[PDB]
Write a protein that holds these residues in place. Structure first.
Motif, PDB file in Angstrom:
ATOM      1  N   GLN A  72       0.833  -1.249   0.000  1.00  0.00           N
ATOM      2  CA  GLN A  72       0.000   0.000   0.000  1.00  0.00           C
ATOM      3  C   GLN A  72       0.859   1.288   0.000  1.00  0.00           C
ATOM      4  OE1 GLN A  72      -3.437   0.464   2.955  1.00  0.00           O
ATOM      5  NE2 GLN A  72      -2.432   2.495   3.171  1.00  0.00           N
ATOM      6  N   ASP A  73       2.151   1.144  -0.256  1.00  0.00           N
ATOM      7  CA  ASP A  73       2.998   2.318  -0.259  1.00  0.00           C
ATOM      8  C   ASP A  73       3.263   2.800  -1.683  1.00  0.00           C
ATOM      9  OD1 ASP A  73       4.349   4.355   0.949  1.00  0.00           O
ATOM     10  OD2 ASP A  73       5.913   3.105   1.856  1.00  0.00           O
ATOM     11  N   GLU A  74       2.897   4.052  -1.947  1.00  0.00           N
ATOM     12  CA  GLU A  74       3.100   4.674  -3.257  1.00  0.00           C
ATOM     13  C   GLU A  74       4.498   5.259  -3.377  1.00  0.00           C
ATOM     14  OE1 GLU A  74      -1.179   6.609  -4.897  1.00  0.00           O
ATOM     15  OE2 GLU A  74       0.214   7.735  -3.625  1.00  0.00           O
ATOM     16  N   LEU A  75       5.006   5.256  -4.599  1.00  0.00           N
ATOM     17  CA  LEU A  75       6.259   5.858  -4.879  1.00  0.00           C
ATOM     18  C   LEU A  75       5.944   7.042  -5.727  1.00  0.00           C
ATOM     19  CD1 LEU A  75       9.181   5.478  -4.337  1.00  0.00           C
ATOM     20  CD2 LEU A  75       9.451   4.200  -6.406  1.00  0.00           C
ATOM     21  N   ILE A  76       5.865   8.215  -5.102  1.00  0.00           N
ATOM     22  CA  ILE A  76       5.501   9.414  -5.845  1.00  0.00           C
ATOM     23  C   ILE A  76       6.709  10.110  -6.451  1.00  0.00           C
ATOM     24  CG2 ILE A  76       3.558   9.748  -4.257  1.00  0.00           C
ATOM     25  CD1 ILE A  76       4.902  12.227  -3.233  1.00  0.00           C
ATOM     26  N   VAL A  77       6.443  10.817  -7.545  1.00  0.00           N
ATOM     27  CA  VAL A  77       7.454  11.547  -8.277  1.00  0.00           C
ATOM     28  C   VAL A  77       7.313  13.042  -8.072  1.00  0.00           C
ATOM     29  CG1 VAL A  77       8.195  12.256 -10.576  1.00  0.00           C
ATOM     30  CG2 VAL A  77       7.847   9.830 -10.030  1.00  0.00           C
ATOM     31  N   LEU A  78       8.397  13.657  -7.624  1.00  0.00           N
ATOM     32  CA  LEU A  78       8.419  15.090  -7.398  1.00  0.00           C
ATOM     33  C   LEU A  78       9.314  15.700  -8.468  1.00  0.00           C
ATOM     34  CD1 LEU A  78       8.833  14.991  -3.525  1.00  0.00           C
ATOM     35  CD2 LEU A  78       6.754  15.493  -4.855  1.00  0.00           C
ATOM     36  N   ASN A  79       8.703  16.244  -9.514  1.00  0.00           N
ATOM     37  CA  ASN A  79       9.463  16.868 -10.588  1.00  0.00           C
ATOM     38  C   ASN A  79       9.802  18.285 -10.142  1.00  0.00           C
ATOM     39  OD1 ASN A  79      10.320  18.384 -12.831  1.00  0.00           O
ATOM     40  ND2 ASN A  79       9.143  17.106 -14.265  1.00  0.00           N
ATOM     41  N   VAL A  80      11.053  18.517  -9.781  1.00  0.00           N
ATOM     42  CA  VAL A  80      11.429  19.850  -9.353  1.00  0.00           C
ATOM     43  C   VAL A  80      12.325  20.481 -10.398  1.00  0.00           C
ATOM     44  CG1 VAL A  80      12.551  21.249  -7.601  1.00  0.00           C
ATOM     45  CG2 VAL A  80      11.364  19.085  -6.958  1.00  0.00           C
ATOM     46  N   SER A  81      11.784  21.475 -11.108  1.00  0.00           N
ATOM     47  CA  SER A  81      12.562  22.196 -12.114  1.00  0.00           C
ATOM     48  C   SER A  81      13.098  21.255 -13.186  1.00  0.00           C
ATOM     49  CB  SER A  81      13.730  22.907 -11.416  1.00  0.00           C
ATOM     50  OG  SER A  81      14.522  23.652 -12.323  1.00  0.00           O
ATOM     51  N   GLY A  82      12.464  20.098 -13.335  1.00  0.00           N
ATOM     52  CA  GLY A  82      12.925  19.143 -14.320  1.00  0.00           C
ATOM     53  C   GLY A  82      13.634  17.978 -13.661  1.00  0.00           C
ATOM     54  N   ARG A  83      14.181  18.188 -12.456  1.00  0.00           N
ATOM     55  CA  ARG A  83      14.856  17.114 -11.723  1.00  0.00           C
ATOM     56  C   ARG A  83      13.796  16.236 -11.081  1.00  0.00           C
ATOM     57  NH1 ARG A  83      17.034  17.846 -14.337  1.00  0.00           N
ATOM     58  NH2 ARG A  83      19.035  18.852 -14.873  1.00  0.00           N
ATOM     59  N   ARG A  84      13.827  14.943 -11.386  1.00  0.00           N
ATOM     60  CA  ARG A  84      12.847  14.056 -10.789  1.00  0.00           C
ATOM     61  C   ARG A  84      13.365  13.384  -9.528  1.00  0.00           C
ATOM     62  NH1 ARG A  84      11.514  14.284 -15.888  1.00  0.00           N
ATOM     63  NH2 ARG A  84       9.349  14.750 -16.489  1.00  0.00           N
ATOM     64  N   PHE A  85      12.578  13.509  -8.462  1.00  0.00           N
ATOM     65  CA  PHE A  85      12.884  12.917  -7.164  1.00  0.00           C
ATOM     66  C   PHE A  85      11.766  11.943  -6.858  1.00  0.00           C
ATOM     67  CE2 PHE A  85      14.873  17.058  -7.136  1.00  0.00           C
ATOM     68  CZ  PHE A  85      16.115  16.815  -6.517  1.00  0.00           C
ATOM     69  N   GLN A  86      12.094  10.830  -6.229  1.00  0.00           N
ATOM     70  CA  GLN A  86      11.074   9.863  -5.875  1.00  0.00           C
ATOM     71  C   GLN A  86      11.215   9.508  -4.423  1.00  0.00           C
ATOM     72  OE1 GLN A  86       9.942   6.911  -9.096  1.00  0.00           O
ATOM     73  NE2 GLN A  86      12.174   7.040  -9.322  1.00  0.00           N
ATOM     74  N   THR A  87      10.079   9.395  -3.756  1.00  0.00           N
ATOM     75  CA  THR A  87      10.051   9.036  -2.353  1.00  0.00           C
ATOM     76  C   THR A  87       8.699   8.384  -2.100  1.00  0.00           C
ATOM     77  OG1 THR A  87      10.468   9.852  -0.099  1.00  0.00           O
ATOM     78  CG2 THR A  87       8.970  11.141  -1.456  1.00  0.00           C
ATOM     79  N   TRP A  88       8.598   7.660  -0.989  1.00  0.00           N
ATOM     80  CA  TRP A  88       7.355   6.999  -0.637  1.00  0.00           C
ATOM     81  C   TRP A  88       6.364   8.003  -0.065  1.00  0.00           C
ATOM     82  CZ3 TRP A  88       7.027   2.324  -2.556  1.00  0.00           C
ATOM     83  CH2 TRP A  88       8.205   1.583  -2.757  1.00  0.00           C
ATOM     84  N   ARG A  89       5.098   7.864  -0.447  1.00  0.00           N
ATOM     85  CA  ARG A  89       4.055   8.752   0.050  1.00  0.00           C
ATOM     86  C   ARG A  89       4.141   8.784   1.572  1.00  0.00           C
ATOM     87  NH1 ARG A  89       0.863   5.871  -1.012  1.00  0.00           N
ATOM     88  NH2 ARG A  89      -0.454   5.099   0.693  1.00  0.00           N
TER      89      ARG A  89
END
Ligand SMILES: [Zn+2]
Ligand SMILES: [Zn+2]
Ligand SMILES: [Zn+2]
Ligand SMILES: [Zn+2]
Lengths: 110, 107, 107, 110
Positions: free
Chosen positions: A1-18
């Motif tokens: 049940q853990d999502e891996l969300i994508v944080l597109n910052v200025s084009g740089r993609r970061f991923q972390t668990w919700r």
């Protein structure tokens, strides 16, 4: 049940668990506010902010400690912390001394 | 409004078309960038340093131009010059630092 | 031999399977990394700092462990610890610098 | 007739014109040697090297000037320059003084 969300910052993609982001509500990333920056036809949040400082912000959620990268301008740093709703009093004891000097030096400018 | 991709030496930056428009007369806030725009990949391409571009791009987002302490003052100026941005607009938070490194440079 | 993708907080690193194997016993040079390996995206995922991982990954390539001067000594140690790498193996080129920052830290 | 080649360094993708790389032959990037690192089923060269230092290397071909980023360890830096076949005597006058001190400080170690 853990999502891996994508944080597109200025084009740089970061991923972390919700999960990681939820550890700290009230902050922009761990509270519904972030829904304001979301393109459903990409399935990712986009932040037109500095990608470099965001690394410290993200490392904060995953470790609880907020560090201050001494290669960064204290103003740029504070600007981002403000945007993300993170209070600089959260700065780890490991980085506080340096943050303190850089902040003070900045305060004595003109 | 929409997202534009600024490919700088392979490092792709994204921002809002209106973010750049906050500063006409400068390469990026002008139609001048349009000559770097590729039509097939549909992204602007710049054969420049991606790290200083980061600082330039941030100037458009915050109105504050910062000087990365770790960067060579010389490489920084060359890059600024290309984007039509005057070092004179560097923020007060970084000016002190900028002027010192520039002084040590001429000597 | 083949390329493996090490996704660290969204920042994807690539290296040769044999590069990591140069150091068993450590998380990455072991089968321990296999628990971070995702089967659908077919890449290893690490919810860690991508900048110190860069230094760790480089240790595998050159045998030299460097200490990034700009990084918090505390954040650096936490990360090292996770990868099963002892600060004691830091290179002589960075040890002097490492020990000084660690000293200023305890005080 | 100008190609835009992709230099995959440690996963970091860099792009430059084949032209830019040719400005300096004899170096690994501007001389056939680089063909040794090429996956034809990706159409890109892969370098299992440090992505951070490579930025200075690449900025060298496009500007002729080789800078020294003072946040980098002098050994890491020299290691990469060696690999790329770039001679540290090419270091711009703007960065030489700093390179000189860092190199000297390194030489007096134990
Ligand atoms: Zn710290
Ligand atoms: Zn500043
Ligand atoms: Zn070192
Ligand atoms: Zn320089």
């Amino acid at each position: 049940q853990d999502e891996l969300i994508v944080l597109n910052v200025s084009g740089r993609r970061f991923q972390t668990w919700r999960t990681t982001l939820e550890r700290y509500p009230d902050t922009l990333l761990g509270s519904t506010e972030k829904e304001f920056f979301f393109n459903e036809d990409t399935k990712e949040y986009f932040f037109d902010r500095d990608p470099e400082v965001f690394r410290c912000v993200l490392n904060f959620y995953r470790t609880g400690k907020l560090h201050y990268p001494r290669y960064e301008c204290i103003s740029a740093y504070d600007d981002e912390l403000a945007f993300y709703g993170i209070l600089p009093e959260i700065i780890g004891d490991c980085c506080y001394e340096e943050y303190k000097d850089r902040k003070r030096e900045n305060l004595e400018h003109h």
